[PDB]
Every structure is written in structure tokens, then in C-alpha cells.
Amino acid sequence: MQAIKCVVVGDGAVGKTCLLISYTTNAFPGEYIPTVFDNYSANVMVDGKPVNLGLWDTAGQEDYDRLRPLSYPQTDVFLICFSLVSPASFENVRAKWYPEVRHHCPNTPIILVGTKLDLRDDKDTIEKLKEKKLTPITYPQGLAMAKEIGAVKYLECSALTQRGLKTVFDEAIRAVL
Amino acid sequence: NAEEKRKSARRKEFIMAELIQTEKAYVRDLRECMDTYLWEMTSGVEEIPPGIVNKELIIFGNMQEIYEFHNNIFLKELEKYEQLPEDVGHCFVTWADKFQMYVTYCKNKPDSTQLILEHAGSYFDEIQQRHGLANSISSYLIKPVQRITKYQLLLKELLTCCEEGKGEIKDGLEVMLSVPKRANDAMHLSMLEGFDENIESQGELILQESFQVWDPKGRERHLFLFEMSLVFSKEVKRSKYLYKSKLFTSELGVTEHVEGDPCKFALWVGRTPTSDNKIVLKASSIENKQDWIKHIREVIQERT
Numbered sequence: 001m002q003a004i005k006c007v008v009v010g011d012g013a014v015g016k017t018c019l020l021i022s023y024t025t026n027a028f029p030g031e032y033i034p035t036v037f038d039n040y041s042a043n044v045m046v047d048g049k050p051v052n053l054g055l056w057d058t059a060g061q062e063d064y065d066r067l068r069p070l071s072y073p074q075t076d077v078f079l080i081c082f083s084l085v086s087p088a089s090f091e092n093v094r095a096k097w098y099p100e101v102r103h104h105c106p107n108t109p110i111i112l113v114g115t116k117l118d119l120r121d122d123k124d125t126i127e128k129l130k131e132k133k134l135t136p137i138t139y140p141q142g143l144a145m146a147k148e149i150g151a152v153k154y155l156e157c158s159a160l161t162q163r164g165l166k167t168v169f170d171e172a173i174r175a176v177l
Numbered sequence: 178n179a180e181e182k183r184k185s186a187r188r189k190e191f192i193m194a195e196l197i198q199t200e201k202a203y204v205r206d207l208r209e210c211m212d213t214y215l216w217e218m219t220s221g222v223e224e225i226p227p228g229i230v231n232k233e234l235i236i237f238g239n240m241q242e243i244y245e246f247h248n249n250i251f252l253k254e255l256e257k258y259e260q261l262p263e264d265v266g267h268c269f270v271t272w273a274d275k276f277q278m279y280v281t282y283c284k285n286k287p288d289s290t291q292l293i294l295e296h297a298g299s300y301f302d303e304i305q306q307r308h309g310l311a312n313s314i315s316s317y318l319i320k321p322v323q324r325i326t327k328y329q330l331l332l333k334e335l336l337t338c339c340e341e342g343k344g345e346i347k348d349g350l351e352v353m354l355s356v357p358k359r360a361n362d363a364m365h366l367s368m369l370e371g372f373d374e375n376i377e378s379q380g381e382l383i384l385q386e387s388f389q390v391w392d393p394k395g396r397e398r399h400l401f402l403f404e405m406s407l408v409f410s411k412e413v414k415r416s417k418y419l420y421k422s423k424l425f426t427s428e429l430g431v432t433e434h435v436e437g438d439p440c441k442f443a444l445w446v447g448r449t450p451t452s453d454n455k456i457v458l459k460a461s462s463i464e465n466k467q468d469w470i471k472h473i474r475e476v477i478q479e480r481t
Contacts, residue, residue, distance in 0.1 A: 031187065031188075031191075032191040032192075035192075035195060035327065035330050035331055035334060036195065036199045036327050036331075038199075038202060038206075039312065039316050039319075039320075041311045041312065041316075054316070059326075059327075059330070060323070060326035060327050060329065060330050061323075061326050064326065064358075064360070065361065066283075066361045066364040066365055067283060067322055067325075067326065067357065067360060067361055067364070070283070070286050070287075070290075070319065070322055071319060071322075073290060073294070074294070074315065
């Protein structure tokens with residue numbers, strides 16, 4: 001029963017807490033999105049090889065460059081999460097998170113996740129981004145950045161509809177194996 | 178605006194309920210960590226590894242102090258204002274200094290963690306296997322660090338939902354933003370190497386940041402602003418700071434506007450701000466520059 005540790009790192013607006021709540025509870029939070037997600041651990045059966053997967057959420061530690069890397073030692077896999085309706089997080093992926101993660105953990109595998117897939121086709125988000133001369137991040141841009149930072153796999157998920165959310169953690173587990 | 182009132186009240190009740198029901202879980206996890214891993218080290222029967230004997234204070238820090246603060250005082254106060262979520266920030270003002278213990282805890286985190294991976298071996302893993310616990314030792318140890326950074330988010334959520342009593346929530350939010358800032362400042366200061374003086378002799382740290390400094394080309398100099406000094410230190414390879422120079426704040430003077438770039442500001446010493454002896458520093462943003470200017474001017478005013 002191998003134990004695997006997965007730490008999620010990203011900006012505040014990426015939505016990592018909801019990303020984990022919707023996966024663990026198998027249901028979108030709904031009216032209230034939780035602010036606190038305690039460390040998770042459960043048995044997951046992947047490819048006939050049961051493992052014990054543990055999930056670490058780093059919410060609230062964005063503006064603290066010394067408190068944040070306290071969770072990095074002894075991490076089996078990282079999830080670098082950005083938002084598809086915010087290019088600022090896409091730039092901070094190569095500006096802030098990847099250098100720190102690769103500095104503290106030179107050999108830990110990384111999965112590049114793009115969240116909020118459901119808002120990409122919205123006609124309100126598109127207009128609001130056009131007001132600021134911004135466009136949503138397409139799939140090829142995410143794939144190119146994943147190849148840039150040497151991430152194992154680029155994936156897109158949606159906490160609202162749970163599309164691709166179950167594949168992210170399965171691929172993260174399979175990366176370690 | 179019936180919908181506005183409904184949404185505000187419902188979200189406020191949800192936030193207060195989460196604030197109480199996560200504090201309870203935090204206290205429970207602290208008690209379990211104290212009664213499972215620490216107990217074996219102190220009053221156990223197994224063979225402790227030679228390198229971690231009599232060193233439970235290093236490994237667990239002052240977690241017992243944090244537990245006795247939360248288990249005996251803080252939670253009883255948070256439960257009092259369950260029906261008055263607008264005043265919960267007051268609970269963070271009376272015990273403002275009581276959170277200074279957290280500043281200590283983080284400072285011991287690099288010391289403890291390495292020890293577990295240097296001399297503990299498979300001791301705590303075997304303890305977890307025997308006790309059948311889901312969490313490892315590090316999962317329990319990291320919890321105060323996470324918890325100190327969760328109060329600010331809940332206070333921010335409550336800030337946008339309250340119509341009256343915004344001042345109390347704002348004060349609590351300021352306190353619970355100051356505490357992690359001090360925790361990060363202390364961890365940065367703990368790597369200051371070569372300081373040929375007393376740390377406590379300079380007062381308390383106020384700010385720290387990395388700048389580009391033109392010595393009277395741009396060279397990186399991490400600055401530490403104490404109540405009585407400003408320390409310019411180089412950063413060299415790990416992340417350790419080499420003490421390079423210091424400036425007494427009483428003799429210091431500030432030039433806010435420097436032509437050629439909006440992110441540059443000058444510092445000078447002596448009665449007369451003579452040219453060619455001006456320390457030019459380039460901030461990373463306008464907000465950082467303004468905050469540094471304000472704090473340095475406050476320090477100078479305090480010293481006079």
C-alpha cells in the first residue's frame with residue numbers, strides 16, 4: 001500500500017480549494033465554496049494497484065514566500081494549477097510557481113492543470129476580458145507552457161461540471177508509479 | 178433588496194459556522210498529535226533512535242502552548258459570538274499578542290523538519306503503523322502554519338458581507354494579516370549571517386524586501402528595516418544573507434522622486450544631502466515603493 005503525497009500550488013483565484021472539494025465530495029459545493037480544506041488521505045485503486053493518496057492544499061500562502069515552501073519537502077507530485085480565464089496566473093506559472101517548485105524539489109513530477117474550463121465559452125467572461133484587451137488561454141498555449149516547464153502532463157478540469165477532474169488525480173498517481 | 182439580504186445573511190452564517198467548525202477540528206488534530214506521537218517520545222516503551230532522544234521540544238516546538246491557548250481560551254471566545262458574526266473580529270483584537278507564539282513556531286519549522294529526516298528514521302512511521310493513524314507526523318506538524326494563514330481569508334470573506342461593525346472586522350483582519358507577515362519576516366531574518374552585533378540591540382524588524390541598489394551599477398541588496406537601523410545585506414548561495422552594511426536611521430534621509438524611472442528612490446546620510454553620495458534603490462512596483470517610503474519616513478519621525 002504505497003503512500004503518495006500530492007501538493008497543489010497556484011494563485012489565489014485559480015480555485016484549488018474547490019478543485020479539491022469537488023473531487024473528494026464528488027459534488028460541487030454549491031451556494032458556499034469552502035475556504036478551508038484540511039489535508040486529505042484516502043485509498044484509491046488505479047490500474048489494479050491500490051495506493052493511499054494524500055492531498056495538500058496551499059490556500060492562503062500566496063503572499064508568504066517563506067511560510068509557503070514548508071510543505072514542499074517530501075512531496076511525491078505537484079499540481080501547478082492556473083486559470084483559463086486569467087492570463088496573469090498563466091504568466092505567474094512560469095514566473096513564480098515553477099522556479100520555486102523546481103528549486104525546492106528538483107526531481108518531483110509536475111502536472112499542469114488549467115481550471116475553470118466551463119467559463120471559457122461564456123459570453124460574459126469573453127466580453128469582460130475584451131474590455132481589458134485580454135483573451136482566454138486556449139489549449140495550445142497551455143500545452144506549449146507545459147512543454148516549456150517540462151511538466152509531465154497538461155490537463156484541463158472544471159470543478160462545476162467535474163469534466164476531467166477525475167482524470168487529473170489518476171494521472172498524478174500514475175506519474176509516480 | 179430581499180435577494181441581497183438573503184444572500185448576505187446566508188453567506189455570513191455559513192462563514193461563521195465554518196470558522197467555528199474548523200477551529201474545533203484543528204483543536205482535535207492538535208490533541209491527537211500530542212497524544213499519539215509526542216506521548217511515545219516522552220512516556221513510551223519503544224527504543225527511541227539515538228539521534229532524536231530528549232529532543233521533543235525541537236521536533237514539536239511550542240505546539241503544547243498553542244493547544245493550551247486554543248483549547249482553553251480562544252475556542253470559548255469564538256463560540257460566544259456564534260450568533261453575532263459581525264463582532265467576531267473583536268476576538269482577534271483582545272488576544273492579538275497571544276498569536277506571537279505562532280511567529281515562534283514557524284521559526285522552529287526548518288529546525289524540526291530536517292531532524293525528522295536526519296535522525297528519526299522509521300520511528301514515527303512505525304508509530305503510525307502501530308496506532309493505525311491516517312496522518313503522518315509532518316501532516317500534524319504543518320497544521321499551525323496552515324491555520325495561521327486561514328483566519329485572514331475568513332475575515333476577508335466576512336468583511337464584504339457586513340454592513341455594520343465593519344471597523345471591528347477590519348481591525349481583526351489587520352491583526353491577522355500582521356501576524357503571518359511577522360512570521361515570514363522572522364524566517365527571513367533567521368538566515369542573516371555575519372551580523373557583527375546583537376539582533377535585539379537593533380529593535381524589532383518592520384519590513385524586508387529585495388532591491389536593486391546603485392552604490393554611490395545596480396547590485397542586489399536585501400534590506401532589513403529595524404527600529405534603529407537599516408541593514409543592507411547581500412544574498413548568496415541555500416538562501417543566506419551576508420551582512421554588508423548598516424545605516425543609522427536618525428542620520429537617514431529620503432528622496433521620494435527620482436527622474437529617469439518611476440520605481441527609484443534615494444537614501445542619503447548626513448545633514449546635507451550631498452550628491453554623488455546617494456544610495457539609489459529600485460523598487461519592484463509603485464505600491465512597494467510607496468509603502469517603503471511611508472515606513473521609512475515613520476521610522477525617521479520616530480527617531481526624532
